[PDB]
Ligand binder design. Structure first.
Ligand code: GDD
Ligand code: OLC
Ligand code: OLC
Lengths: 292, 297
């Protein structure tokens, strides 16, 4: 586990999680989003514990209270992100979620000090265009405030995890385990603070059937769980933040091939612009090694 | 005459020419652009000879047939723009004309061999955003769409083939300013009358009534201001870089657009403003890029 294998790994799970959540679990637009994530991180936790007794990990209290900010950034990342999409459109959220990419690249400079290649700067802007270009080819204040929060919480999150990982020599699995376990409590705070619970009404909603999807989702979410922390650790907090935005293209590109859906050339340019953005960013990484 | 002083000259001239064509001569959208522009190239021609005898330039036959493409490239650059602008909105025309900056920067690779700094690449992409961002912040048979984009594809290359070749033949023929100004004005004058019959419709019973003593007087007014840009356009490309002239020219319209928000109580859009300040960022990156290029060697 090192090198570009991280990125190919992150794809299959984000590819698996996108398909599986839309093919395996049809209409996963549940009443309580955090509960699905609570299981996705809980089914992930159980899966690891089964693996410890068949051979991976460790348990501390010194590292423990230093990771809680990361998890708290995660759930807040979702709460802010979840709240952004309530008042915001999907394409524009990508634009700001793509604008977050830049600061994350320059946020790594404040945690590790590296320089942002002028070529890397070009790639991110192309995603911005590919983001805007796609946005300009579609239709549909409260939102922007939460997106201003998602941009920062998603940044401080992916940044800090990468910090504490290399600080506590957290090998993979270790990253996965702590993020799954420590998020479990915080989700119950936001699950109780945000969702509506009613034993008269919702106790019937997520019945014996629905949980099958939430656990099915968790098993598929196992991939993304392990690979996210593996990507940030080996490569860069920028690399993980970039691949996440790039993934939706082959998924979006798959949506145009595998589907007879009304399209627009503007939408296509965005996807191919995003594809270009990777090539520049892919080559940009090359110029860092060769130059130095 | 050298260095960034060129840019202010090309800027001030493009700015003075913008006002003079829009405030002093309102409805500068004439029925026959080539004749209006033919005068602008004639007053420059007339203007130059008076200075030729008051002190700058030269006339050849070896230079002549190597310069004819520029005037033809120059006038053709306009005809494509005029015909492109018929089917396209002002902001969208801006986007592609800013995309030519990329090829022009990379067209220089085919003409002189310099490298396009990744930092330079950043600016050009940003210019796209300030252009793209503004377009998304605006209002306005398929076979009617495409005719514009088609005419724009030619303007983009002729706009490239134009400023590119001139800068080469300029540095090849040591064309000092005026020479750049003179030759493009002189050799273009005939082509302008060429396009005058090729495009315009003439009717002395009807069109003779259009260009009256007011409008006819105006056609000279615009040329008087265009003396700057004419001398400064070729001055800009020569001293700095064929990219710089293609960049500063695109940069100029920001402060004029910024004037529209300040000097005017006009409905605005934050997107429009973001675009403009995005453009300023575009310059600063390009300014540093030029700064990092000269510093390196
Ligand atoms: N470290 C860690 N990360 C996790 C875990 N579980 C989920 N994540 C991460 O939480 C994020 C949210 O999950 P996804 O729904 O898979 O998001 P996505 O595929 O990355 O897509 C995002 O960008 C798209 C545009 O490119 C958007 O369309 C999408 O809505 C979302 O914002 C992802 O980055 C995922 O890797 C876990 O246990 N641990
Ligand atoms: C509602 C909209 C809200 C506002 C939307 C804003 C969009 C901002 C876009 C791009 C910013 C790019 C910033 C680039 C800063 C670079 C500074 C720097 O340090 O550059 C060094 C680099 O190496 C030089 O190549
Ligand atoms: C509304 C439309 C918006 C769409 C906008 C689309 C822009 C695409 C145009 C040009 C790509 C220019 C990038 C060319 C690739 C540069 C490669 C490079 O610099 O390579 C150096 C390499 O490392 C060897 O040294």
């Amino acid at each position: 586990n090192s090198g570009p294998i991280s990125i190919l790994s992150y794809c299959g799970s984000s590819i698996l999680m996108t398909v599986t959540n839309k093919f395996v679990v049809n209409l996963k637009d549940f009443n309580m989003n955090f509960v699905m994530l609570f299981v996705q991180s809980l089914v992930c936790t159980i899966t690891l514990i089964i693996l410890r007794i068949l051979g991976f990990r460790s348990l501390n209290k010194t590292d423990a209270k230093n990771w809680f900010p990361i998890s708290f950034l995660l759930v807040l990342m979702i709460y802010t992100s979840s709240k952004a999409l309530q008042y915001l459109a999907v394409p524009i959220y990508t634009i700001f979620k793509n604008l977050t990419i830049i600061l994350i690249a320059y946020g790594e400079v404040l945690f590790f000090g590296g320089s942002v290649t002028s070529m890397e700067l070009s790639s991110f802007l192309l995603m911005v265009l590919s983001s805007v270009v796609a946005t300009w080819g579609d239709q549909q204040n409260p939102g922007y405030f939460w997106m201003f929060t998602n941009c920062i919480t998603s940044a401080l999150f992916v940044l800090i995890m990468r910090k504490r990982i290399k600080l506590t020599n957290f090998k993979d699995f270790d990253t996965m385990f702590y993020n799954n376990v420590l998020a479990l409590p915080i989700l119950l705070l936001f699950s109780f603070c945000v969702e509506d619970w009613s034993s008269v009404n919702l106790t019937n909603n997520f019945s014996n059937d629905s949980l099958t999807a939430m656990i099915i989702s968790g098993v598929a979410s196992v991939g993304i769980s392990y690979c996210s922390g593996w990507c940030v650790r080996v490569t860069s907090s920028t690399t993980y933040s970039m691949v996440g935005a790039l993934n939706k293209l082959p998924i979006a590109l798959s949506g145009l091939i595998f589907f007879d859906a009304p399209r627009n050339f503007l939408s296509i340019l965005s996807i191919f612009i995003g594809f270009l953005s990777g090539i520049i960013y892919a080559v940009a990484k090359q110029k860092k090694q060769q130059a130095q």
